[PDB]
Amino acid sequence: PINVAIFGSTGSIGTNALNIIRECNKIENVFNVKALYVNKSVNELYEQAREFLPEYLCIHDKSVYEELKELVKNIKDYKPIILCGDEGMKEICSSNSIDKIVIGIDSFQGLYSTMYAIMNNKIVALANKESIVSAGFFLKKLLNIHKNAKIIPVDSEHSAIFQCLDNNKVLKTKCLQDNFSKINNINKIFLCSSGGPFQNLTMDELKNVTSENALKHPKWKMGKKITIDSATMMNKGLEVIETHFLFDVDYNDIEVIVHKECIIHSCVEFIDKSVISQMYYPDMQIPILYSLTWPDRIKTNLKPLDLAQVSTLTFHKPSLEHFPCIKLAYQAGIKGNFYPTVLNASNEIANNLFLNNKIKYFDISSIISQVLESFNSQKVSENSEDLMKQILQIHSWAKDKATDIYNKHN
Amino acid sequence: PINVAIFGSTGSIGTNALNIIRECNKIENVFNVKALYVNKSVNELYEQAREFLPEYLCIHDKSVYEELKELVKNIKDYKPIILCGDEGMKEICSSNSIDKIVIGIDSFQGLYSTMYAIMNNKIVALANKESIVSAGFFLKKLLNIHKNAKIIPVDSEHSAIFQCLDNNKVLKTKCLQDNFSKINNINKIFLCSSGGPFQNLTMDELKNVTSENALKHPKWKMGKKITIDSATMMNKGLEVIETHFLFDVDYNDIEVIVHKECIIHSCVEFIDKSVISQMYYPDMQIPILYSLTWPDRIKTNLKPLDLAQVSTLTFHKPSLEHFPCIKLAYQAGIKGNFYPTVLNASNEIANNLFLNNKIKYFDISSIISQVLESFNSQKVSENSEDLMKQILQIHSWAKDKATDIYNKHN
Numbered sequence: 001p002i003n004v005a006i007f008g009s010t011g012s013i014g015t016n017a018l019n020i021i022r023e024c025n026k027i028e029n030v031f032n033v034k035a036l037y038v039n040k041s042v043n044e045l046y047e048q049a050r051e052f053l054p055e056y057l058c059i060h061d062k063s064v065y066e067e068l069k070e071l072v073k074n075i076k077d078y079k080p081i082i083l084c085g086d087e088g089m090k091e092i093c094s095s096n097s098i099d100k101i102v103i104g105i106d107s108f109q110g111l112y113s114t115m116y117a118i119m120n121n122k123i124v125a126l127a128n129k130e131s132i133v134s135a136g137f138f139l140k141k142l143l144n145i146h147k148n149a150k151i152i153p154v155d156s157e158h159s160a161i162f163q164c165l166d167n168n169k170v171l172k173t174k175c176l177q178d179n180f181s182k183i184n185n186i187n188k189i190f191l192c193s194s195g196g197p198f199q200n201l202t203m204d205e206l207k208n209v210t211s212e213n214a215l216k217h218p219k220w221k222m223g224k225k226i227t228i229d230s231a232t233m234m235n236k237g238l239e240v241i242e243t244h245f246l247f248d249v250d251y252n253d254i255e256v257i258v259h260k261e262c263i264i265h266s267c268v269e270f271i272d273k274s275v276i277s278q279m280y281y282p283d284m285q286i287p288i289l290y291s292l293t294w295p296d297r298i299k300t301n302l303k304p305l306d307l308a309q310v311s312t313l314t315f316h317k318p319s320l321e322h323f324p325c326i327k328l329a330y331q332a333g334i335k336g337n338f339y340p341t342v343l344n345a346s347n348e349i350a351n352n353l354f355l356n357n358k359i360k361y362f363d364i365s366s367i368i369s370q371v372l373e374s375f376n377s378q379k380v381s382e383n384s385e386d387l388m389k390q391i392l393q394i395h396s397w398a399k400d401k402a403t404d405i406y407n408k409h410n
Numbered sequence: 411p412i413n414v415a416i417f418g419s420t421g422s423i424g425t426n427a428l429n430i431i432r433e434c435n436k437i438e439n440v441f442n443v444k445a446l447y448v449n450k451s452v453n454e455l456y457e458q459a460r461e462f463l464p465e466y467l468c469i470h471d472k473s474v475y476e477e478l479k480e481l482v483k484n485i486k487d488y489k490p491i492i493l494c495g496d497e498g499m500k501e502i503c504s505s506n507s508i509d510k511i512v513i514g515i516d517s518f519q520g521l522y523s524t525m526y527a528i529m530n531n532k533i534v535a536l537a538n539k540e541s542i543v544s545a546g547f548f549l550k551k552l553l554n555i556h557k558n559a560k561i562i563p564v565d566s567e568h569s570a571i572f573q574c575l576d577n578n579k580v581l582k583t584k585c586l587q588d589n590f591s592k593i594n595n596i597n598k599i600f601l602c603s604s605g606g607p608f609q610n611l612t613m614d615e616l617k618n619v620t621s622e623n624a625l626k627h628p629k630w631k632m633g634k635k636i637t638i639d640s641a642t643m644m645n646k647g648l649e650v651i652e653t654h655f656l657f658d659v660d661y662n663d664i665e666v667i668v669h670k671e672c673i674i675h676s677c678v679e680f681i682d683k684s685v686i687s688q689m690y691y692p693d694m695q696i697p698i699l700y701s702l703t704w705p706d707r708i709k710t711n712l713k714p715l716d717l718a719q720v721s722t723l724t725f726h727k728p729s730l731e732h733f734p735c736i737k738l739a740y741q742a743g744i745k746g747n748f749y750p751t752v753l754n755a756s757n758e759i760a761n762n763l764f765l766n767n768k769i770k771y772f773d774i775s776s777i778i779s780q781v782l783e784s785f786n787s788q789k790v791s792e793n794s795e796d797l798m799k800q801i802l803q804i805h806s807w808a809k810d811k812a813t814d815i816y817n818k819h820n
């Protein structure tokens with residue numbers, strides 16, 4: 001059986017992971033959910049524990065630890081190891097009974113748990129694209145040291161790319177390693193984008209779009225931060241950098257393409273110019289499942305793709321004048337060093353300012369551009385601990401700079 | 411260095427094979443063309459010999475054998491082994507200096523050379539779909555005896571399918587082996603079709619179509635027989651049976667889909683319902699190249715696919731009323747036994763009758779249907795030589811039966 005831990009089990013990735021695990025386990029007993037980890041949703045964790053009966057339970061907030069203990073007594077024939085905080089997370093990571101960890105936690109705590117999963121030579125199913133963009137150097141360093149640790153991408157486009165690769169080649173290397181693209185014969189990547197809600201608007205129309213316009217009737221309903229990033233196409237920008245780090249593909253060989261039907265999830269061009277693509281309805285269960293079954297596939301009861309019904313698939317180039325966040329992402333990535341950290345941090349501030357109606361659409365890219373122009377390359381620490389501190393300092397600096405730019409003009 | 415023999419080196423498959431070998435070798439010396447075999451095109455073979463300098467030359471037609479020997483004296487520093495006929499073909503297949511054999515011959519000499527390549531445990535790049543459809547049983551039996559022989563598909567759709575599979579799984583099985591689909595986690599196949607030159611005709615327009623209409627202003631350049639098969643969609647009918655035999659996919663799990671843009675070459679749905687597809691411009695060099703590089707890929711200088719420029723990809727279900735040959739192919743495949751042999755043989759006659767303006771469009775399917783109805787299933791011979799003779803007998807019977815049906819109605 002596949003022994004899986006779910007970190008952030010009540011979030012979007014965590015619940016979709018448990019859903020597909022549930023459905024697949026009805027067809028064949030494939031997964032043992034060995035651990036669940038949440039911040040403070042003690043009741044939701046209890047309900048999950050009642051169904052999945054994991055060996056480990058962990059709650060980050062120590063204040064609800066005793067409440068969890070008492071709730072779990074209601075479940076019969078069940079004596080779990082109940083843990084608290086960072087120390088509990090670390091103990092789960094060190095368990096030789098856990099094979100794979102799904103990290104569905106946002107921000108630093110996602111990176112922190114990823115770090116410990118890697119340090120224990122686990123397979124890490126990673127959805128947090130901001131952690132790859134911001135701390136890619138650090139992750140690459142850790143993966144070079146901990147040879148059996150692997151990051152498997154869960155972001156749908158990156159899963160699609162990963163699914164397009166020959167595992168006879170993938171098994172000779174791993175993601176976030178030098179020469180990954182050479183070993184896999186990768187020439188170029190088509191990174192498919194929905195294009196977001198503003199995809200046909202004029203420059204003058206874009207001047208006055210609000211966050212309500214971005215958040216109005218989503219094609220796929222998702223969190224506010226990513227929805228704003230989808231509207232500016234900074235989501236794709238971040239994903240370009242993620243692609244570069246995960247697959248060691250040069251920026252000149254990554255093309256963003258707008259595919260509004262969201263059936264083709266991305267494509268890989270190999271060195272012979274043959275192109276392989278992965279296709280399905282827009283359903284996050286496939287990328288999550290593949291991250292847990294790789295290098296194998298298992299049966300699901302998901303609806304089969306009806307291509308004749310789908311009927312038409314369309315592709316066009318995004319306009320970088322209309323979606324300048326894409327250009328800024330490429331520029332930051334190509335500059336290298338900690339520019340991607342700066343891009344991510346300044347976008348965090350600009351995204352949130354636009355979300356709360358404090359700035360306009362082109363102010364997002366304006367602020368990010370100014371923060372990038374103010375950053376000076378730093379010597380990259382050789383010490384792993386100093387490197388992590390360096391990333392956090394630069395992240396903090398960039399957020400402050402974005403905020404100061406906003407404060408000067410307001 | 412990949413040591414290759416090309417059988418039928420002046421036909422379409424052969425010349426495209428030599429073109430891509432030439433272009434790839436300019437990038438990196440990967441291929442040695444060890445042998446070239448033609449029927450009677452002695453001057454063309456000489457010109458190829460002058461460039462590629464193969465160890466072996468073979469010409470089927472004894473009457474130009476001496477002319478070939480005299481022509482080859484003009485080539486500097488070159489002492490090839492110059493051979494004739496079936497015996498020359500057999501000697502090439504048995505050479506320890508040949509790894510891979512491209513079968514670019516139609517008719518029987520195709521099946522005949524395929525057999526000898528398999529008997530010598532070679533990798534056989536097989537383009538002749540009629541051979542698989544007609545003698546699939548025999549090929550399976552032979553591959554079970556000669557366990558190191560492998561058939562690698564060159565037919566573009568079947569290459570596409572093969573390219574969509576994980577070689578970590580493919581390497582544990584082989585084409586035309588029982589359980590190929592199970593080992594590769596294949597659930598279903600989308601077999602993509604151009605739709606042919608008659609795809610948009612009304613029923614009334616179809617009743618009056620001639621071979622001239624099929625052969626005029628082609629979308630892509632190809633032979634008369636296959637062009638007629640594309641027009642009736644019997645080409646796709648044959649390819650359904652080819653798919654079943656190559657990949658051990660059930661007929662209920664093979665779907666023919668009309669994709670008029672000819673960019674997606676076919677798709678594989680896996681047991682999780684994830685779909686993988688292979689895409690390129692319609693250029694036969696990719697499938698030929700992959701058959702020779704599998705399980706690896708090599709660099710080419712082919713034009714990269716510009717998806718944005720392609721812009722739109724479309725899919726629809728073919729009409730079985732307009733294209734009854736598709737239905738007849740499924741029926742023959744599902745009934746099994748030697749019905750595919752009968753389908754292929756009767757089609758050979760009906761195709762040629764329509765080509766030469768002797769019968770009308772719907773007479774093609776009428777004749778094939780009548781021959782299929784006439785056939786009586788036979789006990790499948792256990793001995794492989796007895797089985798080959800049985801296939802040949804049934805093939806001859808079915809051609810004669812089709813011909814007699816024509817002669818009665820004429």
Ligand SMILES: CN(O)C(=O)C[C@@H](CCCc1ccc(C(F)(F)F)cc1)CP(=O)(O)O
Pocket residue numbers: 155156157192193194195196219220229230231233235236262265281282283284285287
């Ligand atoms: C899903 N995903 O990984 C995203 O980044 C969101 C993306 C796609 C939204 C639509 C969608 C949702 C889910 C999926 C799924 F389920 F296949 F992952 C595909 C497509 C927005 P954009 O491409 O404009 O940057």
Ligand SMILES: CN(O)C(=O)C[C@@H](CCCc1ccc(C(F)(F)F)cc1)CP(=O)(O)O
Pocket residue numbers: 565566567602603604605606630639640643645646672675691692693694695697
């Ligand atoms: C190419 N091929 O394998 C055919 O069977 C001919 C096919 C496709 C003709 C156009 C074409 C030519 C070459 C290629 C290539 F490059 F993929 F080989 C794809 C498509 C006709 P239909 O699908 O209607 O039965």
Ligand SMILES: [Mn+2]
Pocket residue numbers: 155156157239
């Ligand atoms: Mn994504």
Ligand SMILES: [Mn+2]
Pocket residue numbers: 565566567649
């Ligand atoms: Mn074909």
